[PDB]
């Protein structure tokens, strides 16, 4: 295998590099949320309908009310995790019917109240790329009566006593949830998860997140049909990708198919003897007499019982990661939308600047958007400037040379500017730093005095 | 279910309901004849162990609580069934075997089982089920002299596959000579009589053994016994009984593609899906009978003893064994109000419930998510704070737990 | 308000019954007390009945102890948690969002509890909120100003600068604006005076 | 101070030491020796071991 391209940073004692130009990128990052709450009859899936089967049941004891009271606790875990990730929000905040914000194209994140759900675009591909077992938390039993076609796989679940549960919270309830996150980040900023909801200009609201990742507001409002157009082509190229390709979604998949395939095992280890006569309890009881019969249902018994405890651990485990991706999530949306994050690679790779949330089936979908530097350039580069027997250091900056002449810039854009007492501050003499450099310093009093 | 005496406010899963069945069908063949144990059970000679008689019996009414007054026979000894339970189910084909042994080897006539009698003359599967019935025969095949009608092979070139009978007499041979038929050195007779004397001890009586062997296949049934038939009922939960195997459920007519050969239907949990009615060829769907989950909406027992039930998964015109369908099933007991509050108990997809004075009831009612808003944005609007507060709230974590040691010699045993 | 500890407690104990409570099945034996067993039977059937009870009650306790184990998981990723909130909310200042409480962290102080802790965070909230007329830059000579540290707002006919979390109105100026280029590239800029000390 | 390292290698090895020797335990059979059974017994009470 291969780790990767060789590279070679050309490293020098008085050479540094500074970015001329940016870009704007949107990634997309996918979490589990919550997952398929079940709930498991034991008496009718070890027994049924058979009484024999039920009064050598309860002799084994409460070994049925502590499974049923571990899987009432991962139902009620599911509902909590779901809680705990969208319901941050006190209020449901709107946008408002204008939609011009600064140049910046919200229409396909925003919803659209002509479908029944009002939902995105993003978030109708998002629910249509996650395909779904249709489990049984919509009533069935109907079509489970009525015998069309042929036997589904989740009629015989239902019949032998695995029911599936529905979620608290429906998908409208869910994309409303979003709906007020995303209004109330684009319309208020950061100033809604800390209080009340206080309006911004979403420019100016752009220029305070350029501040917080170290760039001057000033490249935004000189550059802002740009940045406009690169997010504008960056949402269209996350469209594209989730029209095109469907495989970014395989954690959702693999929820949705862990426990199809959990419930499945579940039902087909009905079939075996356990070292019995036979898988069936009725041949069994219809075939032998009282103690044998009680013998070969007993075998049948202790298999089934010991099938249900497995399933039961499985899902304990299962819970116990679900959750912990629950609380990642919870604290992406606290830090990542309702704020700006300064930690690296969290919220998205690149220097974060604001983050939007999108639902998905079994989980969230977050937008990241960052900003990257991307055409740079060499320069020369001393840590402090001799003038009049004074070391001046840069008060936010850097030191830089095109060759000739010396110049102060920030660090993350080039911005060359002309080297002055009020950029910068005097400490101590030239005899004590190690590569200090002789130039001239500007002195803005001096031609007003003159003059 | 909680096993108090007061409960908390909640949502709580109590039990299970079910529709009871109401009716019985049996379906069995129209069968009449007799099967013929009494042509079996006694003879004048049976035939010999190498030589051994078997007898197809098909197409007729068996009742096996006559054996007993046929042969003085201790036990009915069965493998795979039981005798007390061979006249309620019912079988395919079945076999007769008829030979006389010595009382030193009637233990070798049992699955999984080597010998002599076992290894050269009459080997048994080891999946055999079916009754073996022996009984001594010290009156009618023992002599003075000494009785050679009956005999045994002694040994062979190689173990007997089971339910397999050799007739051929060929002189054995164990060494490198030619025996060319005659019975010289290392040349014997492969079989050997008996001798039967009324001198003998216990052990090496003459008894008569007699085997039924039982085909359970999935073909239509050809011989079974007496069980009374019923008239044929559809659309109803009832526990029928089709050729032997019972269950509950109801009975619909059904589009299956049944081959002419086939006469079950079955699940992947392993159970009986479709089923062919014996007596008419038109076969049926088998559903279980309506069933859900119970539970049971309170406030506390301090506030009030009403409740209100919620049948999980029920379309609600279907209910029994204030009423609003919901999509977790649907309740009884809780009225629906066109109003948001806060949830209080949750039920399902979206609706909950709770104890409100508008006389106390309980309501139902879809959550609401918060309140409304629309925050006057404007592109040259901006909305600046002039006064504070400072809030301290409560964030509460739980750190460690109870540690415990358990000594599993005094659990399990206790001295 | 203490309901996490207290199903801390409940768990613990609830656990413990139950497996005092499984002392009493049969699992399928002809008694439950073992003596009853070993005084009823011989050596041979009072082993099979002895031999069912050792099962049963060897399922229970391990059952019991893979319970334990996944609730020890999880009380230690809260206690994961708790410490890393004591070493960012107690002994520092968080600047994480709706870490350390809810509003702008200012202060945390902790209180012991039974089985747990208790945090109680001091917040900064605003309270009281003006609409105001606001502009990204000003043209003053041909020149566009844009504040150093602030935002810029007018009351209706006069234009200053305020920081953002607190309405102090300050005259516009040199010292705490910046110039950066003409008037002709930013959207919105507007037309007020730079006072020059 | 590697001691977190080292318990990840001797749980690993503690666990796969355990898992074989328990090969060695009866479970109230007659014999732990598979063969033995086999050979010792006919089909039932061997099948019942
Ligand atoms: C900085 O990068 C942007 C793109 O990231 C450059 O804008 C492009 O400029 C070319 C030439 O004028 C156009 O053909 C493209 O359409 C522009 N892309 C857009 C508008 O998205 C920009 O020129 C770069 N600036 C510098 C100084 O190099
Ligand atoms: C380094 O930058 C300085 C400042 O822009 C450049 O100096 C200017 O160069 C142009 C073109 O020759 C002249 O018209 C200006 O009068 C110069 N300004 C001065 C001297 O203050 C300088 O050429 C650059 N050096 C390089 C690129 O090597
Ligand atoms: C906006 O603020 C300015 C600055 O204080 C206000 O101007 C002063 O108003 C008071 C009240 O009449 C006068 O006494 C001062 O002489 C004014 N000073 C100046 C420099 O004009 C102005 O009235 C405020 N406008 C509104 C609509 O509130
Ligand atoms: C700085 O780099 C140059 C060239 O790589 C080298 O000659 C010089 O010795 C370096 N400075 C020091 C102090 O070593
Ligand atoms: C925003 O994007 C949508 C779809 O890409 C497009 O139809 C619409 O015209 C865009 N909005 C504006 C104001 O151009
Ligand atoms: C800087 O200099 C190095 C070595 O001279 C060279 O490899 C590199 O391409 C130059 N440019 C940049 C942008 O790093
Ligand atoms: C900088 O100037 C001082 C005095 O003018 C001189 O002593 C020193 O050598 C100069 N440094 C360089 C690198 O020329
Ligand atoms: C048994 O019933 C079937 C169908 O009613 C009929 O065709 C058949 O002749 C009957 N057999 C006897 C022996 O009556
Ligand atoms: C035994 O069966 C034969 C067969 O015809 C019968 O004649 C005889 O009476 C039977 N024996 C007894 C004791 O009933
Ligand atoms: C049946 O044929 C096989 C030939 O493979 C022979 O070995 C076996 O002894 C035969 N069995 C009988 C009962 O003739
Ligand atoms: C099942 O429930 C649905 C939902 O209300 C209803 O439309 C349908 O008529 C019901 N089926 C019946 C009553 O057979
Ligand atoms: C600014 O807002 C006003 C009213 O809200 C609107 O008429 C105007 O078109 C907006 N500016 C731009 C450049 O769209
Ligand atoms: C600001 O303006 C909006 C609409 O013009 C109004 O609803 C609101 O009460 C005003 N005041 C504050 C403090 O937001
Ligand atoms: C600001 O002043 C300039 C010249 O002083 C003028 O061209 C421009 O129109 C003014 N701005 C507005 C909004 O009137």
Not at chain 1, 211 to 217: F, K, L
Not at chain 2, 114 to 131: H, Q, S, V
Not at chain 2, 163 to 187: H, L, M, W
Request: glycine share 6%; net charge neutral; charged share 15%.
């Amino acid at each position: 295998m291969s780790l990767g391209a060789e590279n070679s940073v050309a490293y020098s004692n008085n050479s540094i590099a500074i970015p001329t130009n940016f870009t704007i990128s949107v990634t997309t990052e996918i979490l589990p949320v919550s997952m398929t709450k079940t709930s498991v009859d034991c008496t009718m899936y070890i027994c049924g309908d058979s009484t024999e089967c039920s009064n050598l049941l309860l002799q084994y004891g409460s070994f049925c009310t502590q499974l049923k009271r571990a899987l009432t606790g991962i139902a009620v875990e599911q509902d909590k995790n779901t809680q705990e990730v969208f319901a941050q929000v006190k209020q449901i905040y709107k946008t408002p019917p204008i939609k011009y914000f600064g140049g910046f194209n919200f229409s396909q994140i925003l919803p659209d109240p002509s479908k029944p759900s009002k939902r995105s675009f993003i978030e109708d591909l998002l629910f249509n790329k996650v395909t779904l077992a249709d489990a049984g938390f919509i009533k069935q039993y109907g079509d489970c009566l009525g015998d069309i076609a042929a036997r589904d796989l989740i009629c015989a679940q239902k019949f032998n006593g695995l029911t599936v549960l529905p979620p608290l919270l429906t998908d409208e309830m869910i994309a409303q949830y979003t709906s007020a996150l995303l209004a109330g980040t684009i319309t208020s900023g950061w100033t809604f998860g800390a209080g009340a909801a206080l309006q911004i200009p979403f420019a100016m609201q752009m220029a305070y997140r350029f501040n917080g990742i170290g760039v001057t507001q000033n490249v935004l409002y000189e550059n802002q049909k740009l940045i406009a157009n690169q997010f504008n082509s960056a949402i269209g190229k996350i469209q594209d990708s989730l029209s095109s390709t469907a495989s970014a979604l395989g954690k959702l998949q693999d929820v949705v198919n862990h426990n199809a395939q959990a419930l499945n095992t579940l039902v087909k280890q009905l079939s075996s003897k356990f070292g019995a006569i036979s898988s069936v309890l009725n041949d069994i009881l219809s075939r032998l007499d009282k103690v044998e019969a009680e013998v070969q249902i007993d075998r049948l018994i202790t298999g089934r019982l010991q099938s249900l405890q497995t399933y039961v651990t499985q899902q304990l485990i299962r819970a116990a990661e679900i959750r912990a991706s629950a609380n990642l999530a919870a604290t992406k949306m606290s830090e990542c939308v309702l704020g700006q994050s300064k930690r690296v690679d969290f919220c998205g790779k690149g220097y974060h600047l604001m983050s939007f949330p999108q639902s998905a089936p079994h989980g969230v979908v977050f937008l990241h958007v960052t900003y990257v530097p991307a055409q740079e350039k060499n320069f020369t580069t001393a840590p402090a400037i001799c003038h009049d027997g004074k070391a001046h250091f840069p008060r936010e900056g850097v030191f830089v040379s095109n060759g000739t002449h010396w110049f102060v810039t920030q660090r993350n854009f080039y911005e060359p500017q002309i080297i002055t007492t009020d950029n910068t501050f005097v400490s101590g003499n030239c005899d004590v730093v190690i590569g200090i450099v002789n130039n001239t310093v500007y002195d803005p009093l001096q031609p007003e005095l003159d003059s | 279910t909680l096993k108090s005496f007061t409960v908390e406010k909640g949502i709580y899963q109590t039990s299970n309901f079910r529709v009871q069945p109401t009716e019985s069908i049996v379906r069995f063949p129209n069968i009449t004849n007799l099967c013929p144990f009494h042509e079996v059970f006694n003879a004048t000679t049976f035939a010999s162990v190498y030589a051994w008689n078997r007898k197809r019996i098909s197409n007729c009414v068996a009742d096996y609580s006559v054996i007993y007054n046929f042969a003085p026979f201790f036990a009915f000894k069965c493998y795979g069934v039981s005798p007390t339970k061979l006249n309620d189910l019912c079988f395919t084909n079945v076999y007769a075997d008829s030979f006389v042994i010595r009382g030193n080897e009637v233990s070798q006539i049992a699955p999984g089982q080597t010998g002599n009698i076992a290894d050269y003359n009459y080997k048994l599967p080891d999946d055999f089920t079916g009754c073996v019935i022996a009984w001594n025969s010290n009156k009618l095949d023992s002599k003075p002299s000494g009785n050679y009608n009956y005999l045994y092979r002694l040994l062979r070139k190689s173990k007997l596959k089971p339910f397999e009978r050799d007739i051929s007499t060929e002189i054995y041979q164990a060494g490198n000579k030619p025996c060319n038929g005659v019975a010289g050195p290392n040349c014997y007779s492969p079989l050997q009589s008996y001798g039967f004397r009324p001198t003998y001890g216990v052990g090496h009586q003459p008894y008569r053994v007699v085997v039924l062997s039982f085909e359970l296949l999935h073909a239509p049934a050809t011989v079974c016994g007496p069980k009374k038939s019923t008239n044929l009922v559809k659309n109803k939960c009832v526990n029928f009984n089709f050729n032997g195997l019972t269950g509950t459920g109801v009975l619909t007519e059904s589009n299956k593609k049944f081959l002419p050969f086939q006469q079950f239907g079955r699940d992947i949990a392993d159970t009986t899906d479709a089923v062919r009615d014996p007596q008419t060829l038109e076969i049926l769907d088998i559903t279980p009978c309506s069933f859900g989950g119970v539970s049971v909406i309170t406030p506390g027992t301090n506030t009030s003893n009403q409740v209100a039930v919620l049948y999980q998964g029920v379309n609600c015109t279907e209910v029994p064994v204030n009423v609003f369908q919901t999509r977790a099933g649907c309740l009884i007991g809780a009225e629906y109000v066109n109003n948001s509050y806060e949830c209080d108990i949750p039920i399902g997809a979206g609706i909950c419930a709770s104890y409100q004075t508008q006389s106390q009831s309980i309501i139902a009612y879809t959550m609401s998510l918060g309140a409304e808003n629309s925050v006057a944005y404007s592109n040259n609007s901006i909305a600046i704070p002039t006064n504070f507060t400072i809030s301290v709230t409560t964030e509460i974590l739980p750190v460690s737990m109870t540690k415990t040691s358990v000594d599993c010699t005094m659990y399990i045993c206790g001295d």
